[PDB]
Amino acid sequence: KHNMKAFLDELKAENIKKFLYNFTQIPHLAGTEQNFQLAKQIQSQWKEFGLDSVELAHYDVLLSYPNKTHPNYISIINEDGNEIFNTSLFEPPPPGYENVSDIVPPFSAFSPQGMPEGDLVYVNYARTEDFFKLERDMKINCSGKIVIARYGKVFRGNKVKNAQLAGAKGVILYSDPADYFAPGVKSYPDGWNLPGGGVQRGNILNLNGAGDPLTPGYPANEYAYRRGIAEAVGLPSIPVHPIGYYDAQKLLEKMGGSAPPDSSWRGSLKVPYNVGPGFTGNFSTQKVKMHIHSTNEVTRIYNVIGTLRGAVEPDRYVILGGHRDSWVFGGIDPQSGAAVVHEIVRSFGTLKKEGWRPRRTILFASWDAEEFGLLGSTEWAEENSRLLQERGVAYINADSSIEGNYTLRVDCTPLMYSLVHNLTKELKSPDEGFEGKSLYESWTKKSPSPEFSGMPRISKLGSGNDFEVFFQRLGIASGRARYTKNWETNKFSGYPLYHSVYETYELVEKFYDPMFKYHLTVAQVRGGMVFELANSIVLPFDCRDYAVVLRKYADKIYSISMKHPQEMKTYSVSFDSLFSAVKNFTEIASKFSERLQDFSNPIVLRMMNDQLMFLERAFIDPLGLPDRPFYRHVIYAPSSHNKYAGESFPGIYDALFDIESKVDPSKAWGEVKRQIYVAAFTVQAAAETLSEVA
Amino acid sequence: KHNMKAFLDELKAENIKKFLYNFTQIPHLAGTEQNFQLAKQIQSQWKEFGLDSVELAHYDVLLSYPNKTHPNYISIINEDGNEIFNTSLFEPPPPGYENVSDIVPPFSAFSPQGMPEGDLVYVNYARTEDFFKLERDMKINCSGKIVIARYGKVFRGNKVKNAQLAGAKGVILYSDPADYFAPGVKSYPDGWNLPGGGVQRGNILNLNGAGDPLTPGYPANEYAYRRGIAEAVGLPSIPVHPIGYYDAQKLLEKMGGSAPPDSSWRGSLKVPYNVGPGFTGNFSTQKVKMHIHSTNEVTRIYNVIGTLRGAVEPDRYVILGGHRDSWVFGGIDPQSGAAVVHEIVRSFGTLKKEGWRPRRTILFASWDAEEFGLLGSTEWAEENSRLLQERGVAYINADSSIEGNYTLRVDCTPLMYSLVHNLTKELKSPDEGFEGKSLYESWTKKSPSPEFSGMPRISKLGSGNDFEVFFQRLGIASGRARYTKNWETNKFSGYPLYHSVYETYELVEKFYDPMFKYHLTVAQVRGGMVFELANSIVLPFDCRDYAVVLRKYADKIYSISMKHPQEMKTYSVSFDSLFSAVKNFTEIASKFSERLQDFSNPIVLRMMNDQLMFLERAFIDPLGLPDRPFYRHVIYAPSSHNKYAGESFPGIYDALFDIESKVDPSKAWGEVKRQIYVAAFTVQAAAETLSEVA
Numbered sequence A, B: 001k002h003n004m005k006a007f008l009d010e011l012k013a014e015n016i017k018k019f020l021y022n023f024t025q026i027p028h029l030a031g032t033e034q035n036f037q038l039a040k041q042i043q044s045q046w047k048e049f050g051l052d053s054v055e056l057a058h059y060d061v062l063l064s065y066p067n068k069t070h071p072n073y074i075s076i077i078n079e080d081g082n083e084i085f086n087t088s089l090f091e092p093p094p095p096g097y098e099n100v101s102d103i104v105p106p107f108s109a110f111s112p113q114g115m116p117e118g119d120l121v122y123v124n125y126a127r128t129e130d131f132f133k134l135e136r137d138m139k140i141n142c143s144g145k146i147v148i149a150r151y152g153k154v155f156r157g158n159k160v161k162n163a164q165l166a167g168a169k170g171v172i173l174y175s176d177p178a179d180y181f182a183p184g185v186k187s188y189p190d191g192w193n194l195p196g197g198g199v200q201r202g203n204i205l206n207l208n209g210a211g212d213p214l215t216p217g218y219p220a221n222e223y224a225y226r227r228g229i230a231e232a233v234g235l236p237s238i239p240v241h242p243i244g245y246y247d248a249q250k251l252l253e254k255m256g257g258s259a260p261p262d263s264s265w266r267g268s269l270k271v272p273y274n275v276g277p278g279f280t281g282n283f284s285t286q287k288v289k290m291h292i293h294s295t296n297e298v299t300r301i302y303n304v305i306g307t308l309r310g311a312v313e314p315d316r317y318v319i320l321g322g323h324r325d326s327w328v329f330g331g332i333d334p335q336s337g338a339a340v341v342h343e344i345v346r347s348f349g350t351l352k353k354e355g356w357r358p359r360r361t362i363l364f365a366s367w368d369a370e371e372f373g374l375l376g377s378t379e380w381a382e383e384n385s386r387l388l389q390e391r392g393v394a395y396i397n398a399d400s401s402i403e404g405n406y407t408l409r410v411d412c413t414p415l416m417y418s419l420v421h422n423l424t425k426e427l428k429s430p431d432e433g434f435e436g437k438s439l440y441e442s443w444t445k446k447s448p449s450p451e452f453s454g455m456p457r458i459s460k461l462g463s464g465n466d467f468e469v470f471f472q473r474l475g476i477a478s479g480r481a482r483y484t485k486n487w488e489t490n491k492f493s494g495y496p497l498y499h500s501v502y503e504t505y506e507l508v509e510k511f512y513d514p515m516f517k518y519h520l521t522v523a524q525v526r527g528g529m530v531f532e533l534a535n536s537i538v539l540p541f542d543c544r545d546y547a548v549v550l551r552k553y554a555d556k557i558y559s560i561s562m563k564h565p566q567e568m569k570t571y572s573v574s575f576d577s578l579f580s581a582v583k584n585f586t587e588i589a590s591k592f593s594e595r596l597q598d599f600s601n602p603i604v605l606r607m608m609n610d611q612l613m614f615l616e617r618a619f620i621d622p623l624g625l626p627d628r629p630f631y632r633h634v635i636y637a638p639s640s641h642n643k644y645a646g647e648s649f650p651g652i653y654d655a656l657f658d659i660e661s662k663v664d665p666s667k668a669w670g671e672v673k674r675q676i677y678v679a680a681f682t683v684q685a686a687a688e689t690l691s692e693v694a
């Protein structure tokens, strides 16, 4: 028989291993010839595997690269202007790769050019609350200083945004061993820790879902009108560069000025972690000088788009997508995900060759330029937004399959919760000590839900990956699953070798997943979700799970507001409408579920499947969130302080944030009330899509 | 049998007459108790007639009324400050109505309060080109002057916008006999001409599709957050008041300064039509003084919404809507339309009582507060936008059924052209001399198409009526039909008694349509369209007709640009992408039509009906047009110079308009190129919705 079990049994750990090896022998940086050749290879193989059509969709987007003949570096200079210490021009390459060409040296993509010289201020993780502490509590002024911040906790683009608004004239990012060196493990190549010469690459844009900086709203096709660089979306205005902890120690060791305010500001290096500004007495005349010469350049990128046409509902799309471009070899990010996608396509294709087709159409995507700001997935979604609006059932992302080997990590819309629970109860756990137990059992034991006994944790989607346009802009139900580490406080920081030259096939094969069993488990979860979404007669979404979470989020936002009782009295700030809407949604969702269980009539079925499909779509506000027009979902948005984290009722959350500091409280509380109205209205409107249609 | 002929035969002229009488005995001004009672009556009767559900949907919106104890008027004052002439405080009521209460005196709704005193400038119709002529050619400065303009040619809100941007401190609108007194016909009550004491009421907002000025984007429900008045959408900043031609003559007769520039500036009164500023020598010290004391007030309004549930596709809506509120008795506008809607509901209900139901759901709407800016239809569409987005098949408007008795006038999306041609070939002409001929035959003879022999004229939709939110904001295929006059140059001016106390039942019954045969013909056209849209198996839309018009509009916009060949060379302005997209749309539409004719499979049918339904939707750009976020359709928008007229490729049209006067041509031509890109992209994206789905 051709059922989910046939599909799942065809998936093989050894094939995933072979594909991962094949994808990680050379760098595949977006916009380079090597990544175009890999795109052509995947296109060819997906056709071989049995897909109906496989095409490349290309766009010309703004990318950023170092200048090969004028390298980026940071110096300490003396009063004479002699450079007495220079940071590294490249990471020492790993064993056997010391002769690989085209390894991009560490840089921060989209940094402007400059050579700013100044006194250092150390800003911890450069979070909003770190800048509050510096400026409000310690009275340290970052204006015209070079800020040095440790990576970790929040997206690096937010750090740069925060440093820019503090008045900094440059930003140095570094990896502290406190965040990137696990105690008791060896550094690469002898273990999975970051060596002192390792450096995390990555873009520092603040695009807020815009996609290519030059073409917000529209695909960057052959006739596109491009903004001039001065009007581009999201580019930083100050130079930025990343370094490793051997170089960081040389910059930090001389720091003077104020002591760190507390131990949460101190990393693991043998330095005081003084905040500055500037160096201690003996070195007070030395300065730090950045030399950044990278260039932004419009460059062609290529997505591979494979189609497996549905037998019954070919105009309903279930999309499995993940990126193909990497900073260097991409051993974990993204090729551990891409190898899983490749084996899923192979498996679906095996069933297709035997005469099977899914009920709905499945689209498979290998996205380009994810690492430069989700560019490939966003431009393609801008080009196809009308088809996706009206036909998109769900998007399952497929970036890195492992970032650890401890347990599963799932983030998704509440509409998918029941599907994920049910599927993981049918899959085998790969974990030691759980042989013969379900994946649901191991996952629930290792990652218990904070509010429900005997359930696992499932998080909110934010951004920082290719689902963002489908979920936050277009309102298509989205989900993701991967294996992760125990390390909770590092949940946004990345594994130690993240975006470094050391993230190789050998890293994965020796230290993460030698048997490829975690990869296989992730392939089963992602593939199984796609299979059920594409083949179930009734779409496998449960609206009642949205009702439960909406109440939780309403309680949460009300609790934030209730820290200001006097202002709520003064300005008559009521959450009554929002709770009313949530109560209505709960009542209507319950009734719809009864009809769904209780309804041979394919028009009623498809009418009901359309109500299911358009329910996520109903949370979209076509006017977007304040000053973020491409984040349109009213229940979830990426946090304005950390793109990686999701925020619920983001319009109200941002209106309340730091409200006690606003200099016109009447205006600020008016905006809280406006956002409560928008949220209550959108919840009620979404509820009404589940009422009887006439 | 229950087919269209059964439906059409049930419609009766005598019932329409009875309903019109019943709806026009007292005023039904929006927000008044009389109009709430009429709403309750219609709700009751629609239930009686057989609808499944009939509800009132209420909103609290900003309305405007004169102050009953402090009347509006205009004076000529002398140097001493004595008021030597005053305009009328009310229109002399018509015979038998001299004791009717609650006739609102003439005023311009939403005028601010003020008592500005100054010199008059006469600005013709106050059109964009009239202000260009004054300011660029005649060198007359309107700053700080009171402008007097004749009604006609363009929406009165555009005149006020134009006067405001010219620096005027007040606007006086009047009805010139050249535009409102047809030669050889008697004035009311002895004929259908405007008497010298008659005055046209009407709002002067510039909402650009926003709906209630205080709640743009969201319905004005019980918990809505309202903008403060200073941030409201669309309100004029200078006082405005309308007067009749007896009063106008007293203001114009003393005008001095410059002669009118040519005969197109001279109306039919016995005055010089001097432009001013100010009065001739003897009266040079007299001034004009306005006294406006109207107030804006948030007031409850009520729409009646009736549902006839579809038998097969109840989640697909065909909507027949028209307004119920009138300025005074509403004998033509809107009750000649509302009486037709009432007879259509009665007829559908007769079939329902015999066991019939339409294939799709039909919604019937009696909208409130149309006269104050499309408020009722827009607030309801804001409340229900998600349901309408995903389920709305078509909207047929039903305002005034006659504005004359010469021939049919149809404005609609190209998707409806074939439906209108086919239906009018099956209906009988009511016209004298065409007995036994089709309505298509009489219409085609009296109103020939400018580009096609043997076809009738069908115009573009603009705005100024309740279809605006459904078509221009939400992208739902829309159409309208009514009987009209021969008078081409008055096509936007209104019939003579438009918005006057004289527009009564007797006007209609004596001078427009004594037998009610034109009303019956309009009921057949509107009802027949609704019947076919709601009952045809395949939706009756022809995408190939959009391809034909898109080529016409592309040729038209290219021709405007080609008046500037040097700039097109300098800035490399190419329309090649737009013509390419139009060519692709033509090719794909042809192929889709073949499949549609060539395809027992209800999934393929509904898949194809969805492609038909979502085709109008594909022309919506979610970012809206420049500075007009609620006009989102890329092919059509209301003209920025005249809300009543439609403009094609409005983004490019507005970018090119008066471009030779812009002081940064590089920037202005860059914006032309940006709009060509948006238009070519949207045409191609819409084309792609008609491709095979997978």
Ligand SMILES: *[C@@H]1O[C@H](CO)[C@@H](O[C@@H]2O[C@H](CO)[C@@H](O[C@@H]3O[C@H](CO)[C@@H](O)[C@H](O[C@H]4O[C@H](CO)[C@@H](O)[C@H](O)[C@@H]4O)[C@@H]3O)[C@H](O)[C@H]2NC(C)=O)[C@H](O)[C@H]1NC(C)=O
Pocket: A577, A578, A580, A581, A584, A680, A681, A684, B222
């Ligand atoms: C959740 O769903 C419920 C339906 O179960 C829905 O209830 C609706 O609530 C509104 C607001 O409370 C009701 O609106 C009232 O409607 C009546 C006429 O039906 C009006 O007369 C009322 O206005 C008077 O009273 C107001 C309040 O004191 C005054 O401000 C006003 O000036 C008037 O004097 C009022 O508009 C509505 O009838 C119910 N509908 C029902 C029960 O069917 C509720 O709104 C939903 N929640 C959300 C957030 O949408």
Ligand SMILES: *[C@@H]1O[C@H](CO)[C@@H](O[C@@H]2O[C@H](CO)[C@@H](O[C@@H]3O[C@H](CO)[C@@H](O)[C@H](O[C@H]4O[C@H](CO)[C@@H](O)[C@H](O)[C@@H]4O)[C@@H]3O)[C@H](O)[C@H]2NC(C)=O)[C@H](O)[C@H]1NC(C)=O
Pocket: A222, B577, B578, B580, B581, B584, B680, B681, B684
């Ligand atoms: C109407 O539909 C047609 C399809 O019938 C569609 O044609 C497409 O047009 C684009 C642009 O002309 C083609 O894009 C080319 O794609 C190839 C690879 O397939 C590229 O190599 C080309 O780029 C090179 O040449 C450019 C132009 O000189 C250079 O600027 C560039 O730097 C490269 O050297 C180019 O991108 C596309 O292949 C066809 N697709 C087909 C034929 O299937 C047309 O775009 C549609 N019209 C609109 C308005 O969408």
Ligand SMILES: *[C@@H]1O[C@H](CO)[C@@H](O[C@@H]2O[C@H](CO)[C@@H](O[C@@H]3O[C@H](CO)[C@@H](O)[C@H](O)[C@@H]3O)[C@H](O)[C@H]2NC(C)=O)[C@H](O)[C@H]1NC(C)=O
Pocket: A418, A419, A422, A540, A541, A542, A597, A598
């Ligand atoms: C995840 O798995 C659960 C457990 O199987 C699914 O819930 C079950 O769904 C079925 C089918 O809808 C329900 O069966 C129904 O029983 C009622 C009796 O009340 C009957 O009227 C229907 O004809 C039908 O037989 C069953 O009650 C329900 N079990 C529960 C909620 O415990 C769930 O749907 C799955 N989630 C998915 C597919 O997203």
Ligand SMILES: *[C@@H]1O[C@H](CO)[C@@H](O[C@@H]2O[C@H](CO)[C@@H](O[C@@H]3O[C@H](CO)[C@@H](O)[C@H](O)[C@@H]3O)[C@H](O)[C@H]2NC(C)=O)[C@H](O)[C@H]1NC(C)=O
Pocket: B418, B419, B422, B540, B541, B542, B597, B598
């Ligand atoms: C308006 O009326 C015209 C004239 O009847 C309609 O066009 C006609 O539509 C029918 C049905 O689609 C076409 O018949 C078809 O003939 C082909 C042979 O090519 C065959 O393959 C199909 O099975 C079917 O019998 C007919 O050709 C066509 N006539 C034309 C274009 O002159 C038109 O559809 C009506 N418009 C509406 C309903 O919006």
Ligand SMILES: *[C@@H]1O[C@H](CO[C@@H]2O[C@@H](C)[C@@H](O)[C@@H](O)[C@@H]2O)[C@@H](O[C@@H]2O[C@H](CO)[C@@H](O)[C@H](O)[C@H]2NC(C)=O)[C@H](O)[C@H]1NC(C)=O
Pocket: A067, A068, A069, A070, A071, A295
């Ligand atoms: C990338 O950098 C090259 C090389 O920069 C030169 O060598 C560096 C080590 C340093 O000394 C720089 O200041 C040098 O200019 C740039 O190529 C130079 O460009 C200039 C003017 O544009 C030209 O006159 C020089 O001859 C070039 N020098 C060499 C050695 O080729 C090039 O501009 C940069 N590429 C970019 C910005 O895309």
Ligand SMILES: *[C@@H]1O[C@H](CO[C@@H]2O[C@@H](C)[C@@H](O)[C@@H](O)[C@@H]2O)[C@@H](O[C@@H]2O[C@H](CO)[C@@H](O)[C@H](O)[C@H]2NC(C)=O)[C@H](O)[C@H]1NC(C)=O
Pocket: A071, A073, A081, A082, A083, A084, A085, A086, A089
């Ligand atoms: C730190 O580096 C500077 C600059 O070195 C140049 O650029 C580097 C990226 C690398 O490619 C070097 O080989 C280049 O020479 C050194 O300062 C330079 O020293 C040279 C030779 O003594 C001198 O002629 C240049 O004028 C100097 N340039 C500048 C900008 O000062 C410096 O010595 C290095 N410091 C240490 C401690 O190694």
Ligand SMILES: *[C@@H]1O[C@H](CO[C@@H]2O[C@@H](C)[C@@H](O)[C@@H](O)[C@@H]2O)[C@@H](O[C@@H]2O[C@H](CO)[C@@H](O)[C@H](O)[C@H]2NC(C)=O)[C@H](O)[C@H]1NC(C)=O
Pocket: B067, B068, B069, B070, B071, B295
């Ligand atoms: C509507 O107008 C009334 C009446 O206006 C008064 O009578 C006019 C003919 C003229 O002489 C005005 O200047 C008068 O004020 C307003 O009622 C008055 O309001 C004021 C102060 O608000 C009060 O002291 C007076 O007693 C009132 N006069 C009378 C005769 O009732 C009323 O404000 C207006 N309604 C509005 C603005 O909604």
Ligand SMILES: *[C@@H]1O[C@H](CO[C@@H]2O[C@@H](C)[C@@H](O)[C@@H](O)[C@@H]2O)[C@@H](O[C@@H]2O[C@H](CO)[C@@H](O)[C@H](O)[C@H]2NC(C)=O)[C@H](O)[C@H]1NC(C)=O
Pocket: B071, B073, B081, B082, B083, B084, B085, B086, B089
């Ligand atoms: C034109 O009208 C003004 C004002 O008249 C008042 O307001 C009108 C709306 C109407 O309701 C009148 O009955 C009101 O008296 C006249 O000027 C007023 O005249 C009266 C009586 O002589 C005097 O006491 C007031 O002060 C005047 N008010 C003002 C504002 O000047 C004027 O006489 C009328 N002109 C003509 C030619 O009839």
Ligand SMILES: *[C@@H]1O[C@H](CO)[C@@H](O[C@@H]2O[C@H](CO)[C@@H](O)[C@H](O)[C@H]2NC(C)=O)[C@H](O)[C@H]1NC(C)=O
Pocket: A021, A022, A023, A025, A040, A041, A044, A045
């Ligand atoms: C990755 O695997 C692919 C597919 O097997 C390899 O590409 C093939 O290479 C052979 C031998 O050079 C050719 O004959 C085929 O035409 C290629 N097939 C394609 C591109 O579809 C590729 O060599 C492998 N890459 C690495 C680094 O091992």
Ligand SMILES: *[C@@H]1O[C@H](CO)[C@@H](O[C@@H]2O[C@H](CO)[C@@H](O)[C@H](O)[C@H]2NC(C)=O)[C@H](O)[C@H]1NC(C)=O
Pocket: B021, B022, B023, B025, B040, B041, B044, B045
């Ligand atoms: C318009 O017609 C309606 C409906 O026939 C009339 O309202 C009815 O009036 C009778 C007699 O007063 C009542 O018994 C009914 O209850 C009313 N029915 C309703 C409101 O549904 C109304 O009188 C007519 N109006 C005019 C001005 O002729």
Ligand SMILES: O=C(O)CC[C@H](NP(=O)(O)OCCCCc1ccccc1)C(=O)O
Pocket: A202, A203, A333, A370, A371, A372, A373, A374, A399, A403, A463, A464, A465, A490, A491, A492, A493, A494, A495, A498, A643, A644
């Ligand atoms: O520009 C964007 O929005 C994101 C681009 C890019 N996304 P990507 O590296 O593929 O994935 C984000 C991973 C977040 C850090 C992390 C956290 C836990 C485990 C592994 C990695 C980035 O974060 O740099």
Ligand SMILES: O=C(O)CC[C@H](NP(=O)(O)OCCCCc1ccccc1)C(=O)O
Pocket: B202, B203, B333, B370, B371, B372, B373, B374, B399, B403, B463, B464, B465, B490, B491, B492, B493, B494, B495, B498, B643, B644
């Ligand atoms: O605010 C709006 O957009 C329009 C409100 C309102 N619409 P409405 O009077 O119902 O219909 C517009 C009629 C336009 C003038 C006209 C033109 C020809 C025949 C009759 C009437 C108005 O134009 O004042």
Ligand SMILES: *[C@@H]1O[C@H](CO)[C@@H](O)[C@H](O)[C@H]1NC(C)=O
Pocket: A141, A142, A143, A144
């Ligand atoms: C920080 O420094 C600059 C002076 O160099 C000044 O303009 C700015 O206002 C300062 N801010 C504070 C908060 O002291």
Ligand SMILES: *[C@@H]1O[C@H](CO)[C@@H](O)[C@H](O)[C@H]1NC(C)=O
Pocket: A192, A404, A405, A485, A511, A512, A513
């Ligand atoms: C993978 O699991 C192994 C053995 O179960 C553990 O020793 C190792 O540290 C884990 N690898 C990572 C990268 O966490």
Ligand SMILES: *[C@@H]1O[C@H](CO)[C@@H](O)[C@H](O)[C@H]1NC(C)=O
Pocket: B141, B142, B143, B144
């Ligand atoms: C019109 O009049 C005012 C002076 O009262 C002046 O400010 C304005 O610039 C004038 N405009 C022109 C074009 O003369």
Ligand SMILES: *[C@@H]1O[C@H](CO)[C@@H](O)[C@H](O)[C@H]1NC(C)=O
Pocket: B192, B404, B405, B485, B511, B512, B513
């Ligand atoms: C209606 O038609 C009649 C007779 O056919 C004509 O005399 C009359 O003027 C028309 N009425 C209007 C308002 O045009």
